[PDB]
Write a protein that binds this ligand. Structure first.
Ligand SMILES: [Zn+2]
Ligand SMILES: [Zn+2]
Lengths: 64, 191, 466, 137
């Protein structure tokens, strides 16, 4: 039932899939949403953060 | 205020395109701005490899600028705690740029698109483009050979990329009602 | 339900003989169930002396029903008309784009209304077209016993013409160009900077960005007036804005070269935000003055504070006869004027310096006030050049230990921008003055307090012009 | 849809520099990014689900008042007041007729403009083609 109402409907913290998923207080709206492509999330991870307040320019530089 | 939305928006992304446990470190240190590091560790009561990589994201996104909450120890010695003084502006600033970058991974990708212009000889496994083809074309062979392979070519990028980009378009749409809207919901005041 | 029973009995001759002040009128009309608003409105035709706001004599959309019985050549009295000028400026018109946007949908709400009804009951609308194709339709373009929706923003139903609005005779033609209008306005709304446009200069400019013509432009209001008159809508708040457009349209159709449209892109007080003010305004008071002034030579003006007697003949160009300043005869003091240019430190005290705190003056001003607050018996008011300017003084004084000390002696009442709170506060201030323990009031000279209210002995013993 | 391209949904938040254009063929909200990409190649269909109006990038244009009902009517008027500029009211002068001819032209325009059943407008378009001859005549 931790992952039965999954996608944060029943959220819990799987400490490991060998340790009965020792959880914390977990509840969210989307929560995981693993349907997002991991590579895209990796590509999302692949976005490197530039430096300081020039980044406030850099976002305006990037069209944000 | 929007500050709650700021924390609210942080929860959404850290739960939209992040795992569930990502928001646990959010709320815990969101309870009190200047918080002792162990308190979150204590209440979660979890290992340091179940906390370390999560700490990575908090500073990898710079969302939790863990201020060295130095205290006055009773023994007259070193005292400090990782109190995540959230840098709300700077955190999102990269995020917006981060968002933009993935859109670039779609805004560029629009040219990787529907109708086939290039060619490729599978036998050499090497792509070619139109101008090569007409350069490689012949009065006799109305179709293309492959100087490397002497082999007829095949079109490319027709189905996959068109099909690909639409998928990310929805993924780009996946952020529309999400963060970007709520981001504009920050742009109302930009505090 | 009174205007029926009022019509039942009232409108053949007056109630018996009284000059029924509101004190007498409000009661007396209640007993016989009258909303005397119509009693006077019918009695327009009767009374041998009349009293109303200068607007009712000057505001052409209300100063329109002028009749020879009510006007022809009798005697004119302008009392306390020192501020008449600003009243004539009436022809004021600024454009709340936010309200304007609601008008667009209201225009669409009109657009839908005319379309939907032209689907259903278009014959009488065509009959209205036939009520139009005849000509000006003076029978019901002017005479409407309880109908007239839009007022006459133009002068009292004079500055018009007779040639029909050509095509616009068709409301569908008419409705369309109205959308051209607002969109043009909406187009003009978002100028980056402040822009000032003379009407004629704007005139062809209208035609430039959208080929509209001035001749129809005036016709809008009446054309609108009949239009809504034909469709008995459930609300006007949308359509107030609508008629204002027409009102604007009429106005901009109407006058020139004494009047001008300016659009600041915002209110610079909180500048760098979108709130442009397509302000088109009157500039010369005399122009609105001229007509009634043109009528009768038995025109008389007097304020308790006319000074100097030149600007008004200057500004209004009008042709006076005698302007005598009346030295009040006193065998005694009877009052005291004073001038405090400098404080005890002989430091000149001012307001032109800034809206800000040159801490010398205000700290000096705390003294000035408090010592006066001490000495006088109950009843004292002070005035300030501007509300928020006053706000500074108070706030800083509140911080200082000044206020509590005067709180020991008297009672303090501020002025508010809202009238309601003020109106409450004032009567109390009266009560404290009337009652024993002393009080004090603060307000602003440009304020509504300075315009209407009066201050007698107990109610006023000392004033202060900060 | 208010400020994002109906094709790629690039919000004016996300592309503040987005510049919307529409075509007289269909008057479609769209960003220029698509516009160029769509018709940098040449005459093809509009990139709308349900639009097979073949149209060309030179015919593209910029809305002014966003009222595609007025603007088309404005265009209709613009189309009219280009050729139906040959209308006679001042050239006519007769206050009723100058009213009528304006009413007539506007009725001709409104027929095209009201557009609810615009085939008498097409008949008026024949009359407008006749006007193309009558503005010639
Ligand atoms: Zn090959
Ligand atoms: Zn697009």
């Amino acid at each position: 039932t931790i992952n039965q109402l999954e996608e944060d409907s029943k959220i819990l913290v799987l400490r490991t899939k060998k340790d009965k998923t020792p959880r914390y207080v977990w509840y969210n709206s989307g929560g995981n949403l693993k349907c997002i492509d991991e590579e895209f999330v990796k590509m999302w991870e692949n976005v490197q953060l530039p430096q300081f307040a020039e980044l406030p320019r850099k976002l305006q530089d990037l069209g944000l | 205020p929007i500050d709650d939305i700021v924390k609210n928006l942080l929860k959404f992304v850290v739960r939209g395109f992040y795992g569930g446990s990502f928001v646990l470190v959010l709320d815990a240190i969101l309870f009190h701005s200047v918080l002792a590091e162990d308190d979150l560790k204590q209440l979660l009561s979890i290992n340091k490899t179940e906390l370390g990589p999560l700490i990575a994201r908090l500073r990898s996104d710079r969302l939790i600028s863990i201020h060295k909450q130095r205290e006055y120890p009773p023994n007259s010695k070193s005292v400090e705690r990782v109190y995540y003084y959230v840098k709300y502006p700077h955190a999102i600033d990269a995020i917006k740029w981060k968002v933009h970058q993935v859109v670039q991974r779609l805004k560029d990708d629009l040219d990787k698109n529907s109708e086939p212009n290039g060619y490729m000889c599978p036998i050499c496994l090497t792509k070619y483009t139109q101008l090569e083809a007409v350069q490689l074309l012949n009065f006799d062979r109305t179709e293309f050979l492959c100087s490397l392979c002497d082999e007829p070519l095949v079109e490319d990028d027709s189905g996959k990329k068109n099909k690909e980009k639409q998928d990310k378009l929805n993924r780009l749409m996946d952020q529309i009602q999400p963060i970007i809207d709520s981001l504009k919901k920050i742009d109302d005041s930009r505090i | 339900e009174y205007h029926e029973n009022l019509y039942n009995i009232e409108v053949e001759d007056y109630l018996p003989k009284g000059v029924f002040s509101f004190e007498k009128l409000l009661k007396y009309c209640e007993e016989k169930t009258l909303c005397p608003y119509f009693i006077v409105r019918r009695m327009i035709s009767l009374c041998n002396i009349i009293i109303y706001s200068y607007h009712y004599l000057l505001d052409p959309k209300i100063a329109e029903r002028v009749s020879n019985e009510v006007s022809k050549d009798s005697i004119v009295i302008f009392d306390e008309a020192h501020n008449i000028d600003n009243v004539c400026i009436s022809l004021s018109l600024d454009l709340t784009t936010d309200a304007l946007r609601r008008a667009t949908r209201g225009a669409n709400a009109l657009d839908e209304r005319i379309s939907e009804v032209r689907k259903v009951d278009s014959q009488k609308l065509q009959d209205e077209y036939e009520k139009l194709v005849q000509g000006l339709h003076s029978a019901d373009i002017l005479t409407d016993q309880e109908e007239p929706f839009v007022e006459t923003p133009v002068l009292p139903q004079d500055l018009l013409t007779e040639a029909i609005p050509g095509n616009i005779r068709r409301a569908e033609h008419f409705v369309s160009f109205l959308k051209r209008l607002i969109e043009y306005l909406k187009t003009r709304m978002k100028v980056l900077h402040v822009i000032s446009e003379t009407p004629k200069s704007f005139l062809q400019h209208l035609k430039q960005l959208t080929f509209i013509e001035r001749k129809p432009l005036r016709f809008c209001s009446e054309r609108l007036s009949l239009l809504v008159r034909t469709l008995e809508v459930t609300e006007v708040e949308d359509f107030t804005a609508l008629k204002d457009i027409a009102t604007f349209a009429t106005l901009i159709s109407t006058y020139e070269e004494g009047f001008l449209l300016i659009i600041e892109p915002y209110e610079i007080e909180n500048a760098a935000v979108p709130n442009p003010i397509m302000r088109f305004t009157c500039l010369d008071a005399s122009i609105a003055i001229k007509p009634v002034f043109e009528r009768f030579s038995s025109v008389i003006i007097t304020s308790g504070t006319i000074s100097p007697l030149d600007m008004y003949p200057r500004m209004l160009n009008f042709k006076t006869v005698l302007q005598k300043s009346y030295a009040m005869t006193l065998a005694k003091k009877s009052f005291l004027p004073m001038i405090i240019t400098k404080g005890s430190d002989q430091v000149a005290i001012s307001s032109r310096f800034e809206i800000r705190n040159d801490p010398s003056i205000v700290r000096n001003y705390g003294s000035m006030l408090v010592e006066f607050a001490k000495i006088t018996p109950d009843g004292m008011v002070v005035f300030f050049p501007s509300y928020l300017y006053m706000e500074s003084i108070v706030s800083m004084w509140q911080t200082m230990g000044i206020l509590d000390e005067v709180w020991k002696h008297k009672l303090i009442l501020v002025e508010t921008p809202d009238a309601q709170e003020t109106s409450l506060a004032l009567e109390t201030y009266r009560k404290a003055c009337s009652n024993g323990r002393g009080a004090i009031l603060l307000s602003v000279a440009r304020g509504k307090v300075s315009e209407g209210i009066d201050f007698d002995h107990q109610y006023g013993r000392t004033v202060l012009m900060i | 849809n208010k400020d994002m391209c109906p094709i790629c949904k690039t919000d004016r938040y996300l592309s503040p520099d987005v510049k919307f254009l529409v075509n007289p063929e269909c008057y479609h909200r769209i960003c220029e990014s698509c516009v160029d990409r769509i018709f940098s190649l040449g005459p093809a269909q509009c990139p709308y689900k349900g639009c097979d109006k073949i149209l060309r990038k030179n015919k593209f244009k910029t809305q002014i008042f966003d009222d595609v009902e007025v603007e088309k009517e404005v265009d209709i008027r613009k189309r009219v007041f280009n050729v139906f500029n040959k209308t006679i009211d001042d050239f006519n002068g007769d206050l009723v007729e100058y009213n009528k001819y304006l009413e007539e032209v506007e009725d001709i325009i409104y027929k095209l403009d009201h557009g609810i059943d615009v085939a008498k407008t097409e008949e008026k378009l024949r009359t407008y083609e006749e006007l193309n001859k009558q503005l010639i005549m």
